[model samples]
Target: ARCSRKALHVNFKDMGWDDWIIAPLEYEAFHCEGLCEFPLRSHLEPTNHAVIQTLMNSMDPESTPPTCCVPTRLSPISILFIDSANNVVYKQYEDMVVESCGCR
Candidate 1:
């Protein structure tokens, strides 16, 4: 027998987060439409990008992962952040790309 892969349609309640209060951002792209709020500092960008971390506890992949973009071919970048419990973004942009040194 052969099986076909089906796309998973996840509902807020199923993810174990606050389902009664999500409002996916409708007016813009890169915004966490019903998942998060606005004007959060990005740990990787340092450019004041909007952030929508897990509604409560982020360790739960379903609850804490940054809302990624959909219809991804049009927007091929996976935009995420390392946010803390108090919503403080961790990690340093400088620590991202490593630099090479030459031995004397």
Candidate 2:
């Protein structure tokens, strides 16, 4: 199977020492749509890049580790950041790479 690359934008601001609530940034599944909002947290590291990788199954042959035979691809290059207060935040300029799989 073949797949195309998709990009996501994350936005955030520096909340000094307190961590911004970033739970809103956490998505159970990828939705390439409008912008998303997240609450501010109590404590968290300053604005930074959160990198994540998604698996795109080739589905040609089920081999050990899957990627053993069929290889996957990466996108956007960078990614998401979450906070302890159950909140999430990121920069819009920054693009997060979300992957998909051919497997059901």
Candidate 3:
């Protein structure tokens, strides 16, 4: 998707992916390679910033990945790494959703 001022509207079904990646993990640009991994301590921006790190995964984990070294400190922003052949690596956080709030 072309990066624009418009809000990002992502629906995995349209992308034809069996699943979706959501926030915090860093990834490469579309049609790129070589993952740039970021742990909880590597974030550059503060919460005041527009985008916060989230999580990234092809599927929800039954148990957290052993790689999650720093849990509470990880940001909600995700860095998705997409490679050629139109395959997506993961979903990093782009921005906070209005519905992202978990409050009831």
What RMSD does each model have against the real structure? 20.6, 16.8, 17.2
Candidate 2's TM-score: 0.18
lDDT of 3: 0.30
Q: Candidate 2: deviation at residue 80, Å?
A: 19
Q: Write the per-residue lDDT of candidate 3 for residues 6-95, one digit (tens) a residue.
A: 234445445554333333223222221122223223332213221212233213334333122111222234445455666766655543
Q: Candidate 3's error at 27, in angstroms?
A: 18
Work out candidate 1's RMSD over C-alphas.
Answer: 20.6
Alpha-carbon local distance difference test for all models:
0.27, 0.28, 0.30
TM-score, each model? 0.20, 0.18, 0.18
Model 3 scores worst on lDDT over the 10 consecutive residues at: 95-104
lDDT of 2 at 26: 35
Per-residue accuracy of model 2 over 1-104 as CA lDDT, tens digit each: 12222343443333233244333433222323221112111121112211011122223223322211111222442223455665554634222344432211
Steric clash pairs (candidate 1): 23-33, 23-34, 24-33, 24-34, 25-33, 25-34
- Relative to the true structure, candidate 3 reaches a TM of 0.18
**Candidate 2 segments exceeding 4 Å error:** 14-63, 68-104
